[PDB]
Nanobody, 117 residues
């Protein structure tokens, strides 16, 4: 959480695949998630994964995108299949944790995903 660095974005053809990576600086973690923000739009939830492994997806990305966490690597992933122009946005990862019973959010810098039609 302290530092989250994203990579894996790019410019891809409709129907294409990308894999976003959210590298944590190191290892109270409760949930990690992916969000996206399209031009002039509000930031929306894409997918979440609890420390226990419970996944949740936004209806717009169900089946096409998969969230996973590799604790050995301290990396959160978003595998994106069957990409559509509507998926164009800056994608952000988030880590939520508790320190001395107080909840905190730490966000990544974002990675651009552009899907051309």
């Amino acid at each position: 959480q302290v530092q989250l660095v994203e990579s894996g974005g790019g410019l891809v053809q409709a129907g294409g695949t990308l894999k976003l990576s959210c590298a944590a600086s190191g290892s109270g973690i409760v949930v990690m998630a992916w969000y996206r923000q399209a031009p002039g739009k509000q930031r929306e939830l894409v997918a979440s994964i609890t420390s226990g492994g419970t996944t949740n997806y936004a209806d717009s990305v169900k089946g096409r995108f998969t969230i996973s966490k590799d604790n050995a690597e301290n990396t959160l992933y978003l595998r994106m299949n069957s990409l559509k122009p509507e998926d164009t946005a800056v994608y952000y990862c988030k880590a939520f944790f508790r320190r001395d019973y107080v909840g905190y959010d730490y966000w990544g810098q974002g990675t651009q995903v552009t899907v051309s039609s």
